[PDB]
Design a protein around this ligand. Sequence first.
Ligand code: HEM
Length: 440
Amino acid sequence: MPQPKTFGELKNLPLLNTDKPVQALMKIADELGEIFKFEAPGEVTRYLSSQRLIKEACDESRFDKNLSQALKFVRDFAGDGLFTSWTHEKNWKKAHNILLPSFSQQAMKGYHAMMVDIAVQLVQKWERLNADEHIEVPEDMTRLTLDTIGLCGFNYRFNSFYRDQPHPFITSMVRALDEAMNKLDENKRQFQEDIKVMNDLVDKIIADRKASDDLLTHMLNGKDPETGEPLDDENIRYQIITFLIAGHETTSGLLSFALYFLVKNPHVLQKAAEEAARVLVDPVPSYKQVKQLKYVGMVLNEALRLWPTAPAFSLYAKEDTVLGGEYPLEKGDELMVLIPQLHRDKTIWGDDVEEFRPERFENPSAIPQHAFKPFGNGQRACIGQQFALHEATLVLGMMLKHFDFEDHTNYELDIKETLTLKPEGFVVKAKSKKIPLGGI
Ligand code: HEM
């Protein structure tokens, strides 16, 4: 098995000593191929890049989700919520069983009005810009997703479009997330009561609810079919914090990368815009109209192919096994799935992997199993997938309906890395088509 440069007792660690470790890992994957070993003090893992090896890794009888160091740091505030819990923890299966149906495609009909509420606020903000102004894309997309998850999650309004200093909860959460990633002594005091700012607000809202079909309502009314137990108030709080953590920046990034790819590819933009104009015939889009935005959905999947915004997930071997008939693994050995490399597997996608061509997704069932995994794998895959895609499709569709866009700076893609991926600095100008935008 190949391995990049080691640095004594530092091992490969110094190689991640950069702002952009995943893109660095992609270059290593370019050099070393489909699998390479990567070591740090106390650690070892194997990065997989090919559909061939990744399909085996996705076999749930053989491998299960691993809590990476990043997830263990996030667990200090996300607790035993779905995202940061072991599959074998009682609370994982319990919250999973309870929440699954509330995250189905069917369930999206119930969140649609609230999603529309925030989407309309975004579009009006842009309708109301003067000629001398431009849009900060990922910044506005993050306002949108945070507010949407807050509203659909626990019927709470962060009112991010009424501020440029975020609601104190957002500031604390963002601070906490950033601290947890930087760990990979005043920081410690700040971390502790950012945690406290988060728990305080969420606990309060839960307590107030005690004395509407959103999520929180589902969680207060849910019983796990296996045990017959409901979730306790502490876990509910962790789940709420979890939806925000896992959902806000992944989804914001997707919207940002899609708009980036659209303005860099005017022919696709025009085709996407034509669909939006034909489909979204009402001042407020309906749930069914969003489902008819087929090409918009393809644009989104092709953005996730090139830059999956949660670009790596970790697995461990349940038992001794041999990977791909050539790499023996022991129980507990770790693997990392490098999603952006998987999505550039020429043997699956053809040689033009770097090109933005949404038409690749014209026939989704033509895509081999485990070739496309922006939402992770199996029972530990993203529970928010339908929610994320419905939000992004609704919002992108509305953007395309209501504005023409100008890449006025000729933006140079600069991909910032945290827990997630984002096109940092991406800005555009939006000229309104002056089309009625209505009462929800
Ligand atoms: C485009 C947007 C999104 C992407 C690309 C994404 C990606 C992912 C990935 C890759 C995982 C697996 C992590 C791992 O295996 O360690 C995951 C898990 C999860 N995500 Fe998403 N996510 C997105 C949006 C959302 C949203 C909007 C929500 C909630 C509203 C959400 C909630 C969760 C939860 C609760 C888990 C843990 C599920 C479990 O293990 O039971 N995500 N996500």
